[PDB]
Design a protein around this ligand. Structure first.
Ligand code: ADP
Ligand code: ADP
Ligand code: ADP
Ligand code: BEF
Ligand code: BEF
Ligand code: BEF
Ligand code: K
Ligand code: K
Ligand code: K
Ligand code: MG
Ligand code: MG
Ligand code: MG
Lengths: 524, 524, 524
């Protein structure tokens, strides 16, 4: 309704103070000597986190102007997280430095939009230099290293991730869940396994109790429910009874089919089992074809001139063995030739890139893996729930970080990257003096991350930053050992993707934020 | 509703202060060295914008009177927007100037209604002088220029629009959507293509690309959803003997029909495909006749005496090719008479002037494009959502502005146009001395845009206004380069329509506003 | 609720101050040098108006008593508007004057009830003197003049109204709507105009812009809906297939009834069209016979001993041409006897009385115009919405004023009429001295309008009032030219009816208001 407006430097100060609250809150978590922030939650017990964007998201201020500022820089940490998954704190520190020096330049009466232009040019150039310094991260050693770094110097996490990426490969899927016991644990499921259980509990064939085993069985795949009665199916069972046991996959299996199926499996004339198909309906309908081509069987598609009632023993798929429990169904191997199969693993790759980003990629690469690779799950150990949350957060951080490292390569850590490219951009100049100042502002702000890392140790940022600028190559400061040295040799690695993204995102919002000559909001 | 009344100068001052708050808020965005305003939003993050009407709309003041003033002048920016789409800020600045100088004139005790009379006369003359100064904007260079100017000196956007307008021809449509990646992108679809997919994936001919290609097919156009194949059948048998494929368009095609159709296209009995009609009921039924006349077939209307069972090969439409994928359908080289096409486009032009703006103009011209011209979409690149808002806003501004240039021609930018016609009206006089004063108020106020453009650079407006008024023709001040020169030669162009509009709209509300002797509102 | 009572002068002051607030608010709009009032509105933008009653209606005051006063005198402006349509401001000023001098007289201890009697007697006499002074207003010159005057010296309005009233005659109907473009436009539809559109768009004939033309067709008139009446129809269809096209008018034509009609106009058996009947159920059936006698056709009433299926080729009416679009239908040159036309015109004349003056007259005069004469519509041009409200208000004012003048004639403007009758009543006396004082109060108050018109110019009202009171006849003051002269020759004319009304209503509420010895209201 009724508004309140402020103009010029008067508004810039309020906005800046607002930025500074969010930034000062996020800064303490930066680097190895960084400390932890506690975020209250109304419903439960509090959460303790070193994760930057988690802290940033929770910040909101009275005094609506300061709040506007904070709400604006919150976006840099949020997009940093949503793109890379690590380095949010760094992106925030960069944003703060840029806003500060930038507004300082505006106070000098320099043209703000021109400052923005200079900054953005400086950033594009710096991004080129970054993409240049990057060296591929391939061998499991380096991977374990960047893993350890994103995890705040927990070696176990890095080595565990290196192992997982080693077993299921890069293309393979890796997920992380809460662990029961205190030790971190890595579970790896190979081959075709999907998450659904047996419809009838009577099917257990083994002293394994819940589990069910079928040796070299035949697999039947149906698009439609058997939900009516057992009428249509038995013609297939008659051919299936000749030499083999049988596995069923469909939409669902109702009583009339199930009970009779049970009675026949009990004596049993032939051993049979039935489970729901893996996913939600359409995706799952797509996954039935996966199971089909994998087992060398054919899907029965109601919407074609193949009828559910008529099917022959050759229509069935074959497998070495199959195992079912309350949770998942498993095929121990496909009997179909790898030419056609790998044809389908390759052809699904055209489906891999799409407007759905990672939503499709998790379960699609899941699909690809289940056919070719494997799926992995990391159970994070902790004593208490408050340790559990933070620990798992660092783990997911390390996972994102390693994926980024693998994808875009890595550059020297400890914030030595940005300062190193900044030294290469010293001769860069713009169209006018204002733009020159903008560039110089950006180049100054790229020192921020390192100075903050040093500062969290309670040491001179000026001195360390200088003695680093005195050096060449990967020479940098090791904050944990509080000594200088070669970063790459010390195994301190920043994934290029996260440094690149953090810088890009910081400059994007700070650039716009320093062009503010007016602010409009609701009344207090 | 207990009221509160104020009279005369006592009330005029409150009104003026409010106006001054709205205007001073909008002004900072004026011109190239103009700056940005931040608008808080309850639901989301704040918005950063250089767009004038965007800032104007958000303004509301506590004091009911001041608020009445602001709420009244907000309309000039709004109408500016609804007519031109650019020049909102300018229209606001003109309104502020006229109001200020006018109320001062009332302080002299002059007759307000006569001041309005004088102002309106001066404006009426100035518009003609503008129509004289306006020169055609045709070549892609000029278009690119006005684009660049309205876009706040982003040349890329200016070139993009000129290019697009070149590719889709006149009557072709150009729209802008949020872009996925950081770079700007121009997409162009030529001819008749609508967004619907094949109903069954089994229809696919010539895979991969999951596309269906029909060479010289028959197009079937149905107003109703297709459930049974009985009603469907005769025409299909007629086409199978015909030697040709068949394309289907309806509200939808239900199971029995799809299934029968799929099985028949599979057996290799007939090559067929089916897609939904393009829009919602009135929209789709309206577009069915377009597609019909384009392909020379006749729509089967249950609501007329054609029933689907009775259908003829002549009821069918024909085309050179049709191509369908999961997303879009395309009709290539329809066989419908060029006569019929220009007939229906002409018949749509009567719908073009329809009193309901925005989407009606947008989606109607869209249809036109599909029949004759082509459609284009400009995707705006940005790192973050706030940058996306700023860039995309500037893009639609540049878009409307270029369209305005094409329609009404262009005049010298930098507001040098208004001052130039104002010098031409210097000998104008009215019926009495007061009206004479009104004219002078208008002519003095036409300097405002230029003086503000200069003022936002932090330079003497007085001096620039003088040295410009000393000159003639298109000689003006370049605010970006902060040096003088010919406006047209330096490519600073104001679309004549937005400049003409800004002035008329400003004058209409301000003229009335200075006639206020009393103000009535609710009590605090 | 708990009340609050005040007695005598203490309460009278409270009433008076409120009256004075309403009045001082309305007065500022009086005469040519009058000014404008701004009225806040919660939902939308504020409203700017010179219209008196509009300002009056919006007034309500905190203090309950002052509010009682204002709320009571608001009724004079309201009744003035509801009767005349102009002269609201004048009526208000009269009321304030009368109330003021009256309360003054009450302070002298005069019997209020006697004062009321004196006032009313003086007024009743003053009306006679007015109708004596009244001169016929006929010629388009005069019409244009009083029109222009009520419109606040906008000549275009006077000319437009004169054009319409000359074109459509007096009895003809005139309405006013918001205009598309900036310029005022007068549209005139001669002959039989019909408000409803075609039910099927396929009926379209040779014209474009979706119009249908039938040359020398037959007219069909039905009381009942045609749906299942499809089969009833053909007996008539035989003549339509024989020699000529066909037109249908009824309650409605449902689906499948319509379709058959369309198909035949397509195949080319018969050219036909169908539209809904004009009005709501009972009103409309009366207008059907009008159309019947106009075209020489006969109404078919299912609700009479006219049967639906059987009708003859001669039972139909004939016309030169008919034209239909989405909005309106038009019948050219009915073949019905002038005997029948003037017969229905004459038989409606007892109905022009219509047992009331208000609701019915509006749409009845519409019917009257449509049958013999013609209808006119004035579209009002404006740049912006706030101007549109103001312009159309003055236009509607001028329209009412012209009709009033034509019916009752005109008298000299500038409020010189009343001051002229006041001189004639100088010898008037009552029953006792108090009543005499009342008479003199009315006569004294009749000077008020002129003195206010003068006062809004910032001139001595006393001086102009005296030097005007010194002359005779139509001698008066022109406030726009600010010099004296003959009023009617200068084209300043007040319709006798509005002055007569203003005086009567003002006297009615003011006479009673001064009789107050006590006031009761709710507590704060
Ligand atoms: N032992 C270390 N010595 C020097 N720099 C380190 C060390 N460990 C991590 N860093 C640097 O600190 C940064 C880690 O920041 P962190 O606190 O994880 O928040 P974020 O990852 O969101 O920036 C990385 O850029 C990394 O290069
Ligand atoms: N470099 C420049 N030098 C001088 N005038 C300019 C320059 N760029 C734009 N202008 C003028 O400034 C005005 C820009 O309007 P803008 O500030 O974008 O808001 P709006 O278009 O809503 O008024 C136009 O008159 C344009 O001609
Ligand atoms: N040029 C003029 N000189 C003097 N009086 C005028 C002039 N024009 C109009 N008037 C008077 O002004 C009065 C009407 O003005 P206005 O207040 O706008 O409407 P109303 O009072 O009828 O509601 C009429 O009595 C008319 O005679
Ligand atoms: F504080 Be982090 F590693 F996003
Ligand atoms: F200030 Be704008 F580009 F309408
Ligand atoms: F106050 Be008005 F011109 F009816
Ligand atoms: K961290
Ligand atoms: K702008
Ligand atoms: K008035
Ligand atoms: Mg990290
Ligand atoms: Mg602009
Ligand atoms: Mg009037």
């Amino acid at each position: 309704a009724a508004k309140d407006v402020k103009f010029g430097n008067d508004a810039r100060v309020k906005m800046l103070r607002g930025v500074n609250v969010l930034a000062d809150a996020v800064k303490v978590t930066l680097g190895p000597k960084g400390r932890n922030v506690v975020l209250d939650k109304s419903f439960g017990a509090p959460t303790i986190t070193k994760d930057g964007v988690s802290v940033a998201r929770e910040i909101e201020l009275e005094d609506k102007f300061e709040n506007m500022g904070a709400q604006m820089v919150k976006e840099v940490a949020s997009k940093a997280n949503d793109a890379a998954g690590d380095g949010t704190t760094t992106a925030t520190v960069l944003a703060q430095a840029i806003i500060t020096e930038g507004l300082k330049a505006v106070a000098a009466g320099m043209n703000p939009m021109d400052l923005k232009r200079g900054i953005d040019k400086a950033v594009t150039a710096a991004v080129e230099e970054l993409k240049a310094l990057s060296v591929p991260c391939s061998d499991s050693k380096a991977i374990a290293q960047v893993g350890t770094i994103s995890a705040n110097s927990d070696e176990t996490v890095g080595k565990l991730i290196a192992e997982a990426m080693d077993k299921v490969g890069k293309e393979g899927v890796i997920t992380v869940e809460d662990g029961t016991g205190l030790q971190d644990e890595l579970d790896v499921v190979e081959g075709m396994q999907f998450d659904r259980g047996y419809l009838s509990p009577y099917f257990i064939n083994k002293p394994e109790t819940g589990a069910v085993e079928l040796e070299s069985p035949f697999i039947l795949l149906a698009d439609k429910k058997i939900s009516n009665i057992r009428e249509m199916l038995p013609v297939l069972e008659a051919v299936a009874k000749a030499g083999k046991p049988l596995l069923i996959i469909a939409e669902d299996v109702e009583g009339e089919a199930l009970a009779t199926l049970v009675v026949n499996t009990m004596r049993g004339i032939v051993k049979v089992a039935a489970v729901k198909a893996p996913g939600f309906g359409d995706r799952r309908k797509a996954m039935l074809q996966d199971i089909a081509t994998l087992t060398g069987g054919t899907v029965i598609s109601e919407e074609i001139g193949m009828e559910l009632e008529k099917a022959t023993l050759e229509d069935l798929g074959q497998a070495k063995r199959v195992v079912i429990n309350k949770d998942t169904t498993t095929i121990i191997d496909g009997v179909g030739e790898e030419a056609a199969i790998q044809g389908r693993v390759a052809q699904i790759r055209q489906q891999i890139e799409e407007a759905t980003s990672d939503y499709d990629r998790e379960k699609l690469q899941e699909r690809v893996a289940k056919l070719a690779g494997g799926v992995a799950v990391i159970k994070v150990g902790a004593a208490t729930e408050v340790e559990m949350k933070e620990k798992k957060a660092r783990v997911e951080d390390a996972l994102h970080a390693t994926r980024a490292a693998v994808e875009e390569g890595v550059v020297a850590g400890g914030g030595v990257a940005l300062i190193r490219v900044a030294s290469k951009l010293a001769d860069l100049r713009g169209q006018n003096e204002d733009q020159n100042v903008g560039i110089k502002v950006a180049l100054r702000a790229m020192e921020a991350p390192l100075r903050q890392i040093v500062l969290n140790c309670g040491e001179e940022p000026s001195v360390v930053a200088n003695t680093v600028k005195g050096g060449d190559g990967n020479y940098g400061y090791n904050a944990a050992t509080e000594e200088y040295g070669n970063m790459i040799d010390m195994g301190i690695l920043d994934p290029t993707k996260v440094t690149r993204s953090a810088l890009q995102y910081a400059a994007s919002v700070a650039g716009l934020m320093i062009t503010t000559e007016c602010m409009v909001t609701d009344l207090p």
